[PDB]
């Protein structure tokens, strides 16, 4: 090839470090509070939450 200045291209790929803020809604139904609830049920009064 001839003598000259050539503009050769570069390369970079960045797949690391997704940060993902996504505006959360109403947080949870809080069964991490209900399985650990202070009122512990019995088989005679077994408790159901939908």
């Amino acid at each position: 090839p001839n003598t000259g200045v050539y503009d050769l291209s570069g390369f970079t790929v960045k797949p690391v470090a997704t940060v993902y803020r996504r505006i959360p809604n109403l947080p949870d139904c809080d069964i991490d509070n209900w399985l650990n609830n202070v009122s512990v049920p019995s088989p005679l009064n077994w408790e159901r939450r939908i």
Partner: protein, 50 residues
């Protein structure tokens, strides 16, 4: 007496260069694979600006 006034004549412009593939198909590889089948388009734009 002697009067005086000044004038401006423009002799040049800024030299703009364009990376054609990074303008069109910035970083994504599917776009580069699609742009390869257009052939001599980016090369013609680089040649005219040169």
């Amino acid at each position: 007496t002697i009067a005086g006034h000044e004038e401006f004549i423009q002799t040049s412009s800024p030299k703009v260069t364009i990376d054609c593939s990074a303008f069109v198909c910035s970083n994504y590889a599917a776009c580069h694979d699609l742009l390869s089948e257009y052939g001599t388009f980016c090369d013609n734009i680089n040649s005219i600006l040169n």
